[PDB]
Write a protein that binds this ligand. Sequence first.
Ligand SMILES: CC(C)(C)c1ccc(-c2noc(C(=O)NN)n2)cc1
Ligand SMILES: *[C@@H]1O[C@H](CO)[C@@H](O)[C@H](O)[C@H]1NC(C)=O
Length: 342
Amino acid sequence: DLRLHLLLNTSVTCNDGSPAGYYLKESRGSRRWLLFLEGGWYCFNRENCDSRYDTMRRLMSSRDWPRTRTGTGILSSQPEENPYWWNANMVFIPYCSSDVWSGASSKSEKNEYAFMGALIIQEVVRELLGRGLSGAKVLLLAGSSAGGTGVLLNVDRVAEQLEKLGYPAIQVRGLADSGWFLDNKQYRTEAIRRGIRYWNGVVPERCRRQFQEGEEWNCFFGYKVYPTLRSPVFVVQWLFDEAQLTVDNVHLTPVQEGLRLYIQNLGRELRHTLKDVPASFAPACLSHEIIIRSHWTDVQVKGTSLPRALHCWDRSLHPLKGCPVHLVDSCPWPHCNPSCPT
Ligand SMILES: CC(C)(C)c1ccc(-c2noc(C(=O)NN)n2)cc1
Ligand SMILES: *[C@@H]1O[C@H](CO)[C@@H](O)[C@H](O)[C@H]1NC(C)=O
């Protein structure tokens, strides 16, 4: 089990002003640290955030958080469930800022909600340094869905934070799961543009300098922000991600030619954006998220599982014979890979 710690700096808060926090299971015989960013969409104005506060309150407040959580998937400490990093120090950072981990704004007389996702990550890292992180060799910032996009937005800032604090030996890396989206045409960007304004959202500096004022929303799209990053980042993305299809207004419920071509083109476009991403795992499946699922070990691309690919990635950061790190399906329809989740 991972144990809850609310942030000692209580000015770093969830949406409603309650303290943010993290769940930790230490592994004193390890210098590897996995910090995982939870996902869960976002909200972008007063009315939609109010609605989220009524029925998704755990994503906006720590008041009801449990004292413990069970680590699953890549957060499991059992080698049978987690062949990759079972002995690591495990950190689960709950998503309670509704800002894709980008915000740096407090609750005030002018702001009903605080959007502090970028500051939550920084404060977690700072407080962990006093709990063993100061001795780390590798800090892997991982995350799923909105948390995967959060990795892309924050991994280089964590690296810069540790450098500035005097810890240049800690190697910061990212693992972005299900956070690599396309700003494509729907079958039948503006929400993020409005969100950034509402949240005081921040994006990585090199990407900000490319796109400039008013265009920072571009940096929430993996294929645009990834080339600007300096830290090594492994990208996990289903080719037919359900959240991508949802925003595209595709509801598979008789697939005629127009939709067939739309779906095939989506997979081809996603595959194209990953062509120059050397550490990636992109199976041809209709699904969403993978890394904290208990059966995350099951799917394979070209005969290689994700835990294996991540191990090969570790070796590459010390090509490798029989240990690949670039694993993108080429078949063009969901479940053309037999190992897809059923
Ligand atoms: C628009 C952008 C790239 C910021 C974005 C698009 C979709 C999601 C998203 N889709 O699904 C989820 C989720 O968090 N599921 N649990 N997030 C997050 C960000
Ligand atoms: C608490 O966090 C805020 C926001 O990052 C920061 O400005 C402040 O200095 C922190 N307080 C302490 C005591 O470190």
